[PDB]
Design a protein around this ligand. Structure first.
Ligand SMILES: [Au+]
Ligand SMILES: [Au+]
Ligand SMILES: [Au+]
Ligand SMILES: [Au+]
Ligand SMILES: [Au+]
Ligand SMILES: [Au+]
Ligand SMILES: [Au+]
Ligand SMILES: [Au+]
Ligand SMILES: [Au+]
Ligand SMILES: [Au+]
Ligand SMILES: [Au+]
Ligand SMILES: [Au+]
Ligand SMILES: [Au+]
Ligand SMILES: [Au+]
Ligand SMILES: [Au+]
Ligand SMILES: [Au+]
Ligand SMILES: [Au+]
Ligand SMILES: [Au+]
Ligand SMILES: [Au+]
Ligand SMILES: [Au+]
Ligand SMILES: [Au+]
Ligand SMILES: [Au+]
Ligand SMILES: [Au+]
Ligand SMILES: [Au+]
Ligand SMILES: [Au+]
Ligand SMILES: [Au+]
Ligand SMILES: [Au+]
Ligand SMILES: [Au+]
Ligand SMILES: [Au+]
Ligand SMILES: [Au+]
Ligand SMILES: [Au+]
Ligand SMILES: [Au+]
Ligand SMILES: [Au+]
Ligand SMILES: [Au+]
Ligand SMILES: [Au+]
Ligand SMILES: [Au+]
Ligand SMILES: [Au+]
Ligand SMILES: [Au+]
Ligand SMILES: [Au+]
Ligand SMILES: [Au+]
Lengths: 171, 171, 171, 171, 171
């Protein structure tokens, strides 16, 4: 509230609420991804667990943003959460590509908020994004790109399968 | 006997004896499955161990039913145990499909006994089935459906093999 | 009270209070049983302890019912507790037979409450009885029937005494 | 299969399958014995436990034979398992006599298989029976004969009961 | 020597020396197998280790026979050790087939010595072979037959590879 609020624009407050919505939508997407891979007719438990852990990470991201909104004296406002873009997610390849697209969209929202913070001369906001969000997204996206390459290699060819097994079983 | 027996119909007592027979038949089927996969010309030790553990689970199920029959004051009666439906069990795929068919048949007998208990207004019976049988069967059948999917994926294609290896070796 | 009460009929509330009365009456009966076997002219300390432990079990049963009555928003009402049916309890055989009759009467009250719960479509009540009462009564009644048989065998004959000693001292 | 099988006659393979059937039948007999002594109107828990442990021993015997059949390259074949000879087992005396008769029948089958092994010049078979079966049966039969004597002594007379108590309580 | 020697025929003494030669030849064969799989252009270290452990087992077998020859008062005589049948061993499949052929030849020599012992009425010899050789050979041959099946399955087809991976990676 107005008792503590200092150098915290209405533009940033609003964008923070919208980012919270995006992270919770992402978390819901990952919940859907996770339970799809849990289906008896899909049955890739490691993929289910990968996506379910991401759902938790995304929710934790929204919660840190909400805590920050209150620390700055803004008002947390919650919007409807849109259901995920698909009801069935295809193969592991299709799923990881959708995951990367999703993370890139969050990453772009983080950068757009960083840009707003910079235009509003709000260094606390930039510091907050730097310390808790930007590097984490870069690391996750790298890990997903890695996974995508390995899925493609494995599902593509027996040269691919061969190189994977040597790396994973011998090295 | 008649000293303790209360609210325990002759219909339920009989059906309990028949269920015991079905669980021991299932256990014998799994013993046969297990030793088939132990053959030098089949030699899938993990499959042998999976089926042998199920044989133990099924016997434990029959033993809990027998203990319950005595706790309610009914008379345990034993019938001939029919030998398993096959002498050789084919591939891992063929075996897991036969296992699922078998479990579904036990599950249906459990539900038919639950229905009888309900028509006989025997809440202790329902509670007993709920606490020790229905959820266990659902979980086992899910695990078998999972296994079936993974066997099908692995024996089907190099996309399938690829996705399996990524899940199992990378995630 | 009316702040929490949901799907909890007046019929069930009343029957719960009456069941509480029956369990406390049973507990009082067992207290009397216990101290009878403590008399210097009876002096069967193990029987005294068996009955005194049952008095505690029955009181604990009434207390769980009272806690449940409050959790559902009903009003615990207490009635006079009738004294036990006898002032002296005869032999161990006479006492264990009276105990079994007593437990069967509680068991029947539990089943009658289960029936009412079912007619009132109160699944929480059924679950509560299933999880804390029905199986416990069945197990206790079985144990009492066992004890009755062994008392009868021991007080009956030297074949009986003989078989008991072999079971208890050799096996 | 034929890849490993060496010096293992079809006569021995068949007799091994039949012995497996006999040990599983014995195990089923002991399961029936055990639950009979568990009845509320019989209620000799130590006898129930004695017979139930024997059911496990007999099943373990059949399992070792099945493992050996596969180690030698023979084919495990399973037959119907006949239900036990009685539905009710009488007294402890009647039960232990039936147990001894049963063990003697297994012992004779072991000796008949040893004889066949010897006529087929199969030293591995003889060694297997020597190391896992013959001595175990002799020890069990001795223990049962001991038990029979003590049951007879106890159920017979007060000289008998007296000598038992001195042995068991003083020595 | 003649100071201790009792019931130990010259026929058995000679055959024991010849069996020692066969076990040392087998050990030398396995040494060759092991170092072949160690070649940089073969490079299957687990196979190298399997065969090298068998070379040690075979040498230990010859050493137990030599110790027994002295315990019975016979004279250990050593003969030239023929080099292995091949200088290069082909694939893992070719190698395991040659290993099984080799073990079957030792097994047959053990049985032929057992037969001689029996014709010479030498029960100590039979006991020695029973306790240290016959069962060990049966177990090893079974394990090799198992390995052969799995190699064949793996090198044969992607159904085969698939079933192997499910067994080994999921179960
Ligand atoms: Au899952
Ligand atoms: Au998961
Ligand atoms: Au800034
Ligand atoms: Au920034
Ligand atoms: Au900055
Ligand atoms: Au590996
Ligand atoms: Au790997
Ligand atoms: Au691997
Ligand atoms: Au096995
Ligand atoms: Au196994
Ligand atoms: Au019911
Ligand atoms: Au039910
Ligand atoms: Au129910
Ligand atoms: Au792996
Ligand atoms: Au794996
Ligand atoms: Au792996
Ligand atoms: Au007392
Ligand atoms: Au007491
Ligand atoms: Au209900
Ligand atoms: Au109920
Ligand atoms: Au219910
Ligand atoms: Au004793
Ligand atoms: Au005793
Ligand atoms: Au005693
Ligand atoms: Au029992
Ligand atoms: Au028992
Ligand atoms: Au023999
Ligand atoms: Au023999
Ligand atoms: Au022998
Ligand atoms: Au004693
Ligand atoms: Au005693
Ligand atoms: Au005693
Ligand atoms: Au090496
Ligand atoms: Au090596
Ligand atoms: Au001999
Ligand atoms: Au021999
Ligand atoms: Au022998
Ligand atoms: Au694996
Ligand atoms: Au594996
Ligand atoms: Au693996």
């Amino acid at each position: 509230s107005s008792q503590i609020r200092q150098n915290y624009s209405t533009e940033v407050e609003a964008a923070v609420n919208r980012l919270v919505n995006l992270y919770l939508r992402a978390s819901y997407t990952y919940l859907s991804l996770g339970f799809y891979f849990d289906r008896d007719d899909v049955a890739l438990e490691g993929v289910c667990h990968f996506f379910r852990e991401l759902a938790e990470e995304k929710r934790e991201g929204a919660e840190r943003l909400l805590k920050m909104q209150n620390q700055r004296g803004g008002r947390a406002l919650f919007q409807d959460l849109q259901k995920p873009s698909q009801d069935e997610w295809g193969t592991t390849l299709d799923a990881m590509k959708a995951a990367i697209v999703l993370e890139k969209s969050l990453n772009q929202a983080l950068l757009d908020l960083h840009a707003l913070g910079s235009a509003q001369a709000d260094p606390h906001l930039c510091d907050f994004l730097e310390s808790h969000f930007l590097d984490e997204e870069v690391k996750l996206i790298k890990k997903m790109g890695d996974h995508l390459t390995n899925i493609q290699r494995l599902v593509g060819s027996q040269a691919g399968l061969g190189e994977y097994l040597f790396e994973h079983c011998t090295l």
